[PDB]
Every structure is written in C-alpha cells, then in structure tokens.
Amino acid sequence: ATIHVDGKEYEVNGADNLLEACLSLGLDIPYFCWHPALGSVGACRQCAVKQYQNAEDTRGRLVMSCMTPASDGTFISIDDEEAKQFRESVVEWLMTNHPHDCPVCEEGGNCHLQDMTVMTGHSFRRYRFTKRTHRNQDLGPFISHEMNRCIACYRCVRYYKDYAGGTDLGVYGAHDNVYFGRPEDGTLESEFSGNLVEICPTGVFTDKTHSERYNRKWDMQFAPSICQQCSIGCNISPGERYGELRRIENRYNGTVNHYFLCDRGRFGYGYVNLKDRPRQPVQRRGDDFITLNAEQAMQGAADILRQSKKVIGIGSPRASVESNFALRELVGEENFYTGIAHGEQERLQLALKVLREGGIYTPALREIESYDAVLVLGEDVTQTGARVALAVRQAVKGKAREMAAAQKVADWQIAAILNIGQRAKHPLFVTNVDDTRLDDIAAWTYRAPVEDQARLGFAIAHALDNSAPAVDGIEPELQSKIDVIVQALAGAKKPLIISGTNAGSLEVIQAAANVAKALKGRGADVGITMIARSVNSMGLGIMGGGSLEEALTELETGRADAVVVLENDLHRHASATRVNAALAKAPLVMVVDHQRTAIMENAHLVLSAASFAESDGTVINNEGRAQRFFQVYDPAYYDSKTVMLESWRWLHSLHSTLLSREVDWTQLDHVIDAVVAKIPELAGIKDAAPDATFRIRGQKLAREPHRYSGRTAMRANISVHEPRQPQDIDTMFTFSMEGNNQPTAHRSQVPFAWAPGWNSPQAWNKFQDEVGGKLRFGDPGVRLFETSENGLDYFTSVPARFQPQDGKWRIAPYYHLFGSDELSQRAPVFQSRMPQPYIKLNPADAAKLGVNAGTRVSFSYDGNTVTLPVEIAEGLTAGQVGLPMGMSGIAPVLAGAHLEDLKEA
Amino acid sequence: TEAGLLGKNIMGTGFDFELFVHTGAGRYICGEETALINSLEGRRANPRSKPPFPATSGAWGKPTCVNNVETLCNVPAILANGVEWYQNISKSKDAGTKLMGFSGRVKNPGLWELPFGTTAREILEDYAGGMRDGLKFKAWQPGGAG
Amino acid sequence: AFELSAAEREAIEHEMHHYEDPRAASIEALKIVQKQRGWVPDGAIHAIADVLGIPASDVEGVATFYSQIFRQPVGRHVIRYCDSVVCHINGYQGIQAALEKKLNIKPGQTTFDGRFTLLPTCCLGNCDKGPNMMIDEDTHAHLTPEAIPELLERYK
Ligand SMILES: Cc1cc2nc3c(=O)[nH]c(=O)nc-3n(C[C@H](O)[C@H](O)[C@H](O)COP(=O)(O)O)c2cc1C
Ligand code: SF4
Ligand code: SF4
Ligand code: SF4
Ligand code: FES
Numbered sequence A: 001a002t003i004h005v006d007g008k009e010y011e012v013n014g015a016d017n018l019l020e021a022c023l024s025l026g027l028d029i030p031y032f033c034w035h036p037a038l039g040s041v042g043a044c045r046q047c048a049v050k051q052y053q054n055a056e057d058t059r060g061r062l063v064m065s066c067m068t069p070a071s072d073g074t075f076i077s078i079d080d081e082e083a084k085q086f087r088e089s090v091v092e093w094l095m096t097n098h099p100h101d102c103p104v105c106e107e108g109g110n111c112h113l114q115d116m117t118v119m120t121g122h123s124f125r126r127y128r129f130t131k132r133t134h135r136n137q138d139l140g141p142f143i144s145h146e147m148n149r150c151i152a153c154y155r156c157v158r159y160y161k162d163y164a165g166g167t168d169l170g171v172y173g174a175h176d177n178v179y180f181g182r183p184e185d186g187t188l189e190s191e192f193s194g195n196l197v198e199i200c201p202t203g204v205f206t207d208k209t210h211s212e213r214y215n216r217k218w219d220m221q222f223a224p225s226i227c228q229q230c231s232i233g234c235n236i237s238p239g240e241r242y243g244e245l246r247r248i249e250n251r252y253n254g255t256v257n258h259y260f261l262c263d264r265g266r267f268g269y270g271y272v273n274l275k276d277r278p279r280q281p282v283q284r285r286g287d288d289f290i291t292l293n294a295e296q297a298m299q300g301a302a303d304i305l306r307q308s309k310k311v312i313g314i315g316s317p318r319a320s321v322e323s324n325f326a327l328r329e330l331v332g333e334e335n336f337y338t339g340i341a342h343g344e345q346e347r348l349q350l351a352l353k354v355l356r357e358g359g360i361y362t363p364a365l366r367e368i369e370s371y372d373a374v375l376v377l378g379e380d381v382t383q384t385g386a387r388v389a390l391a392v393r394q395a396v397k398g399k400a401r402e403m404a405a406a407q408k409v410a411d412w413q414i415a416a417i418l419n420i421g422q423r424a425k426h427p428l429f430v431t432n433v434d435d436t437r438l439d440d441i442a443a444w445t446y447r448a449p450v451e452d453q454a455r456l457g458f459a460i461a462h463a464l465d466n467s468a469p470a471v472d473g474i475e476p477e478l479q480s481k482i483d484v485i486v487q488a489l490a491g492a493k494k495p496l497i498i499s500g501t502n503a504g505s506l507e508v509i510q511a512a513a514n515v516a517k518a519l520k521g522r523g524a525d526v527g528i529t530m531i532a533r534s535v536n537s538m539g540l541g542i543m544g545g546g547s548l549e550e551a552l553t554e555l556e557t558g559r560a561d562a563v564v565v566l567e568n569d570l571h572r573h574a575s576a577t578r579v580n581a582a583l584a585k586a587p588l589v590m591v592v593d594h595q596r597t598a599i600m601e602n603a604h605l606v607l608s609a610a611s612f613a614e615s616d617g618t619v620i621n622n623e624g625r626a627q628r629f630f631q632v633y634d635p636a637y638y639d640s641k642t643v644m645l646e647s648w649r650w651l652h653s654l655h656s657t658l659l660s661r662e663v664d665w666t667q668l669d670h671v672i673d674a675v676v677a678k679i680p681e682l683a684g685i686k687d688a689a690p691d692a693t694f695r696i697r698g699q700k701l702a703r704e705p706h707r708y709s710g711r712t713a714m715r716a717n718i719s720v721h722e723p724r725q726p727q728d729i730d731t732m733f734t735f736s737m738e739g740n741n742q743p744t745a746h747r748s749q750v751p752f753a754w755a756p757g758w759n760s761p762q763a764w765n766k767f768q769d770e771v772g773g774k775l776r777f778g779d780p781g782v783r784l785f786e787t788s789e790n791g792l793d794y795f796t797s798v799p800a801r802f803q804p805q806d807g808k809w810r811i812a813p814y815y816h817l818f819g820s821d822e823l824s825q826r827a828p829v830f831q832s833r834m835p836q837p838y839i840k841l842n843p844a845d846a847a848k849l850g851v852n853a854g855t856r857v858s859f860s861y862d863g864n865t866v867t868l869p870v871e872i873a874e875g876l877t878a879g880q881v882g883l884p885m886g887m888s889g890i891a892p893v894l895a896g897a898h899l900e901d902l903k904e905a
Numbered sequence B: 001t002e003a004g005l006l007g008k009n010i011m012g013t014g015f016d017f018e019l020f021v022h023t024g025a026g027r028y029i030c031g032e033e034t035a036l037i038n039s040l041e042g043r044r045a046n047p048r049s050k051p052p053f054p055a056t057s058g059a060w061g062k063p064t065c066v067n068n069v070e071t072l073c074n075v076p077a078i079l080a081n082g083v084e085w086y087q088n089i090s091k092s093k094d095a096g097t098k099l100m101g102f103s104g105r106v107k108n109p110g111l112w113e114l115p116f117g118t119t120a121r122e123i124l125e126d127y128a129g130g131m132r133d134g135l136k137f138k139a140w141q142p143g144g145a146g
Numbered sequence C: 001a002f003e004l005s006a007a008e009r010e011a012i013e014h015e016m017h018h019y020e021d022p023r024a025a026s027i028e029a030l031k032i033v034q035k036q037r038g039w040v041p042d043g044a045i046h047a048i049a050d051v052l053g054i055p056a057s058d059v060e061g062v063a064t065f066y067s068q069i070f071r072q073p074v075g076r077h078v079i080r081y082c083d084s085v086v087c088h089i090n091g092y093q094g095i096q097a098a099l100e101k102k103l104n105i106k107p108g109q110t111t112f113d114g115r116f117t118l119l120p121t122c123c124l125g126n127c128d129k130g131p132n133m134m135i136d137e138d139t140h141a142h143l144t145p146e147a148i149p150e151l152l153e154r155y156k
C-alpha cells in the first residue's frame, strides 16, 4: 500500500491502520486509547490527522488515524494546523480535571499523559473552574488506585476484560463521572493484573510494591534479564536504585512475552531485597561463624576438598547453564547429580525427548495465539505457566478473528470483531484434577485423576488413529465427550497439545505425545508445548546427571564425603529427614546459594552466590530457547564488604584453586565456550547473546538512562570521595550512563525503552521494526534444537483406571501462582497474597471421615504428621486429597504420591 | 398474536415473526441506533463505530435494521395504497406526510400530520395559533434540542 | 445479605427467554429488582450476575450507567420533574421552587420521613402539555406552583 504523509511517500501494510503504520515509520502521532495488542476503538480522539480525498485536495477532514485503514493511495497530514489544534484541544480537555499531582505521583517521568501533553505543545491553562474528584478503591497488595488521574481512555477495561479475560474490573457511571475499577474493594483476581501499570497511560494503576521504595525512572539502573519464577522465559527489565531491586518492568520480546508478564514475575522479585541474604562467605568453626574474603574461602575450600576422597555435586534448575556446568566440571560428570527427584527427572527427560525427538514443532509463546484448537492435558497452566494461559486465551479468540475476517472486517477494529464473534470460540479442552482458571473459556473441562487424564489422552489418540493403543473400559458418556474432542481436533487446521511435568504423571506426557503423533499422521499442523517447573529445568535436563536420590545414597553409604550443593533447597525435591540425615553424616557440605536456605545450618561452607540481579548467565525455557540474563548492579558498590559472586565464578575459581593452587575467577565467555565445547547439545547458548567485546560503534551498552542523578551524592554519607565506576568484564553492558541505548542500535538486548519525547513504556514502539511486531534486529534468544525429521513411536503403556484405596489418599497437586515457586514465596509482598493452606477433600470422603469445611485434619507423610484445615472440593474425585504444592512444608515432589493415616485432629 | 397476525405461520404464508417490547432505563444516548443495539444486548449504551453497519453485523452480530416508530407507521399505508399514492401526497423532494408541531408559549401547542413543504409560519400561525398575548416571537428550534 | 425472591427469579428467567443471549436481560432484571424493592441494593448486583451468568462488574456498569436504575435508597414516592428546555420555557423553575418549599429538600435528596425523593429528569415526551413531572408511575401535566401542594397530598 502507498500512503502520502505531509507530502512524503511511504510503503506500508494495507491491513494496518494509519496510526500503527505511521508509528512504524517513525512519525509521531499522539495517542491514548490505542494499544498494539488491544486494537483500535477510537475513544480518546487524540490521534486525529487530516485525511484528503486525493492529491489535489486542500480542505480535508479530521479522522482518527487508529480507526482509519492505511489503504493504498492514502493522503494524510499529521502536521496540519487544524489537526495540531484539535490534538492540543484534546490534551487540554483531558487536563481540565487532572489533579495537581505530578510530584507525588508514581507515574511522573514514566507517564504517557505527560509525554503527550508535552508532545502536543500544550502548556498554558485557561480553564478556571473546579476539577472533578473521585474516591479511590483498595485493589490488593500489588496495584494502587488513584482515579483522579484517569483520562477515561478505556485501556484498562479493554486489556483486563477483552484480552486477559478478567471479570472483576469494569467501567461504571456516566458522562464525566466514568469510574474504572472494581464493584467493591478487593484484590484484583486476574493473574495478569500487573500489566495494568504499563497499560494505563496515567498514574491511576501503579506498582504498589515499587511505591513502597519509589524512585523515578531516570534514577534506575536497568538490565535485560529473564524472569526466574517459572519456565516460560519472559524477558524482563529489572531496575535498581541504592543497591536494592526496585522494579521489574516488562522487556519487549516479539517472540516470547511481548507486552505482558504474569503477576508472579512482576511482583515476586522481593526475595532479592531480603536482609537475611548471604553477603560474604561464612565458615563455621565449632558452633561459631567466621567471615572470609573470597581468596581465603577459595584456599580453604580447595584444601579441604583436596583432602577428601570423592566430591559430588548437586545442581539446581534454579541455577544457570554456566553454573551447573561449572559444578559438573569441578566434581566431574560421573560425580555430578541433578538436584531434582528421580520421577521429576524422568518426566523432564521424557518431555525433552518429545520436544527434540518427537518430530512435532514446539511453538514459541507468541506463536501459541495462532492455533485454532487447544488440548491441555494435566497441566494447570494458569498457576504454573500463566503466560501460556494468556496466549491460549488469544488463540481461543482466534475464531471470532476468523469470522470477522470472513466479513472483510479489518483485524484492528476490535469492537467489530468482538461483535461478530459473540461467544463463538476455538475449542479448548482442559483436563485437571479440579477446576482451572481456563474453564470460563474451555469448551470442556475434565476433572479426573492423572491416570484417568492419561487414559483420556490415549483414547483420544486411538480415536484419531487406529495404530495408537486402545483404552478398554470407557463409559459411553466419556466416549461421547472423547468423540467431541476428536471431532474438534481432527477438523482443526492447527491443533495445539499442551502438557507438562507439573501434573506429576509420566503417562500424561506419553498420552500428549500420542495425541500429537496421531494428529501429525493425519497431515495436520500440530504443535506441542511442554511446561517445565523452574527457570532452567530444561537446561538441567539437557545437561543431565543422576537424580537427587542417587546423591543421597552416595552421601548415606559414605563413599562420597564432600558434597557441593548449588542454588538448591533440597527439601523441595526430597523428604526433609533423609536430606538432613545425609547432610549431617557428610563431613563436608558446601552450599553456593543466594538465599538463606534450611540446609545452611548443616553447611560447613556457605558461599554467597549472586541472585539473577547480581549475576550473568544463560537459562533454557520450556520452548528450548537459550536466553542470556545480565547483571543489573554491582552489590559491592554501596557496601564494599559484600563478597557476592556469580556461581560459575565461585565454582571455576574453586576448580582452579583445586588444580593449580591459584585463584583465577573467570570470564563469562570462557565458561560459555567451555559449555559449547564439552556439551554439543548446548552449543546454541553461544549465540544467545554477543560476547563481552560487542560494541555499538565502539561503545558499550548503557545500563542507566542519560539523566541518571545523584552520582556525587548517593555514596557521600559513606565517603565524600566518589568510588570508581564498576567494571563489567563479563558482558557488553557498562555499569554507567557512558554507553549506547539508541533504538536504532544494531542489537537485540535492550535494557530499557526510552526515546526523546517518549518516556513511558510506549518507547518500545521506537525499539521495534513495526509496532506490535518484533525488535528491529530480531528478538534475543535462539532455539537449541530444531524439529526432528522423524517422530517417536506410540507409547503402548496405557495406565489402568484409578481405584481408591482405604487409608491411602492419592495426592492431587494444587499449584498456585502465588506460592508454588520457592523464591517468590520468599518475597514479603507475596505473604499478603498468600492463600491459607487448605487441604482439599471430596464431599463424600469428608462425610465418610466426619469432617466439615474448616476443620483441622492431621496426615502422616514420611513418618511425620502435619495438620491442615479442610476445604471442600466438589470436582476432586474420591480417593484423592488435594494439597498445595511448593508451599511451606509441602514439597512439589509430593504430587502424585500417596498418603497414610489422614485423621481428624 | 390471538388473531394469527403474529407468531408462527402468519396468514398461512410460512413466515414466523415474534415481536417483543423492551422498556428502557432512562438514558438519552440509547436513542442512537448503535447505542440502542448495545443497550438491547444488556450493555452500557455506548455507540459503535461504522463501518460495519448494523445491516451487516448489528444485534448479536446478526443483520439488524433499526427504524423510527413513525417510519414503520408510514410503511403500511405505502403497502396498502401503493407507491404512486405515497409519491403524490406532496410535490416536494421528501415524499409523504410527517408529524409536525409547535411547542412553547404558543396558544395551541400540539401535533398535526402535514405534508413536507409546509412552512414554519403556517404551523405556527394556522395550527399553533401564534404566540400568546403579550409575547413577541424571538426565535425557534425546528427539530428538537439538537 | 441479599437473596432474590422466587417471583423476581422467575421474572428474570422469563425475560431471559426473549433473547438469544442472557446478558440482554440485565436491564430488565435490574428493573424487576428495583420494582420489588424500591432500588437495587449491593447484593442484588451479584445475585443478578450469578443468575444471568455475566460478571458482577458488567451488572454494576449497567446499573450505574442508567439513571432510572437506583443504586442508592429512595423514598416511597419518587417525584421526577422535567428540567428540559420546553418545560424551562413553560416555567419548571416555579414548580421546582414549590416542590423545594413543600418538601424542604434539595433535588437528589429524600425527605426526613422517607416519603418523597426529588429528582430532576430529562424530557418526558410531553412538551406540548408542559411543565410536566412524574410521580412513581403517573405523569402530571400543566403544572402550576399552586397545585403542587394539593397534588403532592395524593401520594401517602
Ligand atoms: C444522541 C442521539 C439520540 C437519538 N435519539 C433517537 C431517538 O430517541 N429516537 C429515534 O427514533 N432516533 C434517535 N436518534 C437517531 C438514530 O440514530 C437513528 O437515526 C434512528 O433511531 C433510526 O433511523 P431512521 O430515522 O431511519 O428510522 C438519535 C441519534 C442520536 C445521535
Ligand atoms: S498521571 Fe501523569 S500527568 Fe497525571 S499527575 Fe501523574 S505524572 Fe502527572
Ligand atoms: S484508569 Fe488508566 S487505563 Fe483505565 S481509562 Fe483511566 S487512564 Fe485509561
Ligand atoms: S509466566 Fe513464568 S516466566 Fe513469565 S512472568 Fe510469569 S513466572 Fe515469569
Ligand atoms: S488512539 Fe485513536 S482515538 Fe484513541
């Protein structure tokens, strides 16, 4: 398509509207109510341009550029005097009721309304009458509410309801008394409510966790990092000030998590600021503790490990690929063990084998939204991999998109698309032990035990292909629902099968693989998605190693006397009594970690590892994509006594001091080259980011904005003499303003979005090739494995039906977005969001045991009895008991396990 | 409905039509046709952007036509007396009759059915009786508050 | 502690029968609850929402959008006087002054005994017979300030 803007000719996409086409070209049109992910509605009237009928037209007509298609031969003017006057008038109308709040408003310096007020050139007030005011609501621990600052742009309700599927936010009232919020005071129930603070162009919805320790955007130090709180791999921008992690902003990745995080990633960062974190290496002598510097810790640990007969290693899916590899190098591959349990490891390697040997393409998170039928087997996606649930919601709305495209409706005119596709949607079939948050859009929800979910999957596979193994003993009603699922999946042009390791069953993953293979054999464009548990679960599975039980047997038989434990709370993957026994028996326990874990009282040496904010590394998401995270700040800048190093730096220095009796720390690229040389299956992590010698025209990439303030006063209470700038020999980023953050810079790693005149999150428009697309020179991260040419065979081990047993309660997992990821539970703001741990019972089982709702019942596991209060769960089938995985005292390894002597307390 | 003019198989022609009455809740914006459609769907009566028009995707995404009471009341006379009768009511560009009237401080405020092309002074003086005694005509609005 | 009665619920489902989407019965459900109880209390929003299968935010947005759906308690009789342009020409301000003198309240307020709620309203479609006002279901036209105290005593 050809458009003519202010006399200049441009080539654009004819399926785009004029606002997105002009913003993709670098032109500046002010806008409020349009968002790239939400489409156009034409509410705020800010984006007015003057459209002419042809080239020889002089009058024109004011139109909304967001509501006008960028068709071939369009003639518009942005800098027309009437259009500029109207845009300034719209800003002025928004400013009549706006409170005098910018100094005490958390959006200041990051405010889209401030930027557009300046952009329209409106700075003189002639309105002299009263300003309307509003009372505020309490919205829960994460989002602060200030309705005085609202410009009624409807972005919040459109995102929250139409995009995110939330139900407790809305618009109320009338003409100029329109109020955006909840019907009453209460916590926002959506798992994606935290994106409101970036969606809202004003300071109505603000990050309350940031507001407790507020600082302005120009004062932050940013880095491009990866969210550690689950396996999805959403790109984030952690921003710090005065040594503490202050905020987590969304970092745009056009392939992964484009505009949106989940609330666990956005608000579950507070463990980094915990005061009980290890700051320096501590060694226990008798019952006392002494603090060493890094050189003495290396010398002493190397001497003691050299004296030992066999050192074994216990990695973690928390830790990066470099640190796990450095542990495997320090102790040896045969003496290296993965820190996860045997069944967890078997499910993880089966998921990996399906992903990289199943012959079926695994889509990225953005690509999930294009599939026209979704079958979720076992995985409670909203509580474990929430952004996948958001993408599946978009894929479900794909049917309304298709029916609107049949009627020649433009893809950005979102209200018309929603009107045409009233309640029609692509088929979603979710299976779980109970009800899920996807049930409001699911075509069918199967509440059954994990073996019954696997039997449903195998029956679906056999009904799609007769070569797949059959399931005997299917009820006619279940058979009819299976036929409904099979007819939906067979007629789909792009079916997606989602599963994961959180369901705690191998047969669920095998059933998902068999359904994917049956759909592949019919010539369909089937995709398969696996959901892992932690941030680098797939990296630990690719690296491999023995299970935690093998390391426990090594430490219990006594043939291993030294154990290194990296970034691992061992009680999550094994019983606490066995771990405590094996660590009390071991004459040397060394723990490299960044959080005060429960195995640090039996640890002879504790090394203060860095968290993700203070470290660099590579993590593998469940898609198979290697992603590099970068250090945000130097922990020794404000407190010079802090000895907090990268985990791979600690372990490499330990290996060097063991071999050559000399302390060499390392560089990061040397560890990357070591990983890709010893491990060919991790050879893709070299290309995840450029090395530390990468430059943009000779200069490094800046971590802090240009107007970073207080550089001669922020440490002046300690000493008036300014310290040296911290040196980053690890990466291509500099710990200073003296660097490059241009939107046109040839790079893929962007620490923060800022452009002149665009101080809000809308500067990501400037950092993109087209708005809502990808980053200009490609999204960061590369895929480790491609689709295999040949798939697997059908798994013939169909499990039997679940039979309840008397005195034997099968544990059904109940994951929570706030509580099932260990580090996020450590965050103090998650305690207010923390649900009370309730054990779920069937009405029949609770009636048999004579316990009502809210009564305390005690159950015995691993020879220990614990008491939990009863919540009645109707959907949970009999013979099962529901437990919240990952909580304080309930390990995720308990999922799929049995339980004995459940008695009323 | 009792006489067979509404419901199933109207006049033995196989045409099914059901007519409902939906009473409003007091907002002026609901009279706008797309906002009327939104209000009929049980939503806040915000109007919709056109295109698409309600004829293609209106009420619940279905083809929908919204018409005034007086237009629908003009339809049966057209279909009972013929097109050429309706075209010959007045010699004006707007065919047919129209309910016109005058309100305010006039002697006879009311409503009369007149052909298009009747002047405002004819409605004010002949039909409305002019202004009241001791009142001088300053201004007038032809067709409502807008 | 709100609970929908059997008659209210049955009327709501009968309204749901007339549409292809049960969301379209939200305004009529709110009006049914208002007709039974005088206004729509806070728990009625959640009750109507769970009957219709729509979120309570949608029901509250509808209820607060429409002026005739009362979300605050009113008196036993609601006087709604027209304050639009033709009744302004016909002299609604004398009617408003007479009503304020008789009831000793401002518009939007309720009398001390809870008998009358005074409300301005848009044009009642009775402009040739103005000034007009609406008491609970009756329209009174050709209003004069002298007839207001006599006509207000017909509603107890
Ligand atoms: C603010 C506004 C209020 C309106 N109110 C009414 C109304 O009350 N009654 C009506 O018939 N048309 C009203 N209309 C006009 C409608 O949009 C539409 O033209 C009409 O309902 C049906 O068109 P018709 O005249 O061809 O039958 C209103 C329009 C606007 C912009
Ligand atoms: S929302 Fe923006 S313009 Fe309004 S007070 Fe806050 S910083 Fe200022
Ligand atoms: S609260 Fe924010 S996002 Fe919502 S309408 Fe107001 S300004 Fe827009
Ligand atoms: S979905 Fe997972 S990776 Fe993404 S923000 Fe949430 S916890 Fe982090
Ligand atoms: S951005 Fe176009 S009208 Fe709001």
Ligand code: FES
Residues within 6 Å of the ligand: C082, C083, C084, C085, C086, C087, C088, C122, C123, C124, C125, C126, C127, C130, C131, C132
């Ligand atoms: S102006 Fe009052 S009834 Fe119309």
Ligand SMILES: [Ca+2]
Residues within 6 Å of the ligand: A614, A615, A616, A631, A646, A728, A730, A731
């Ligand atoms: Ca570093």
